[PDB]
Amino acid sequence: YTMSLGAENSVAYSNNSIAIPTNFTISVTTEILPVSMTKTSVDCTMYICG
Amino acid sequence: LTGTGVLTESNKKFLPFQQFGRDIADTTDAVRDPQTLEILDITPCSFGGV
Numbered sequence A: 001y002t003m004s005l006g007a008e009n010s011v012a013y014s015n016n017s018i019a020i021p022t023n024f025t026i027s028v029t030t031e032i033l034p035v036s037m038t039k040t041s042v043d044c045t046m047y048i049c050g
Numbered sequence B: 001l002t003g004t005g006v007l008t009e010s011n012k013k014f015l016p017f018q019q020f021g022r023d024i025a026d027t028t029d030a031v032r033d034p035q036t037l038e039i040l041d042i043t044p045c046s047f048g049g050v
């Protein structure tokens, strides 16, 4: 299929109306970041020739 | 099949037609002695970085 970016949301804009929140949600989200890799050392002489 | 290693006793039970043993990385880590049909693990010698 042709993908859809998101649901349409026509914001009810006018020159004298505002939307004020009356409540809140405390949301906890995860962010995973790699920091380091495996430290590898190669004996070049032994790898090429044994 | 030649190489250098420490030959220890092995708990790997070979099938009777198999002679050598390989790990994931296709290196010979198990072998069968031709004189006496026993299985030997080939641990690589203790190479290290000084």
Ligand SMILES: *[C@@H]1O[C@H](CO)[C@@H](O[C@@H]2O[C@H](CO)[C@@H](O)[C@H](O)[C@H]2NC(C)=O)[C@H](O)[C@H]1NC(C)=O
Binding pocket: A010, A011, A012, A013, A019
């Ligand atoms: C503020 O008012 C506007 C219009 O008076 C609301 O917008 C409508 O929302 C309904 C619900 O989905 C839609 O079917 C209409 O098409 C919207 N109209 C327009 C002109 O956008 C809006 O939802 C109201 N906001 C709140 C928080 O109640």
Ligand SMILES: *[C@@H]1O[C@H](CO)[C@@H](O[C@@H]2O[C@H](CO)[C@@H](O)[C@H](O)[C@H]2NC(C)=O)[C@H](O)[C@H]1NC(C)=O
Binding pocket: A022, A023, A024, A025
């Ligand atoms: C704001 O939202 C919270 C939840 O997001 C509301 O707390 C709930 O209130 C109802 C009835 O008052 C209870 O049945 C729920 O158990 C409550 N949820 C939690 C997590 O405590 C709160 O009432 C809302 N406040 C306003 C003013 O709308």
Ligand SMILES: *[C@@H]1O[C@H](CO)[C@@H](O)[C@H](O)[C@H]1NC(C)=O
Binding pocket: B034, B035, B036, B037
């Ligand atoms: C080969 O020689 C060894 C030496 O004792 C013997 O034990 C073995 O039975 C012989 N035969 C085979 C097939 O290994």
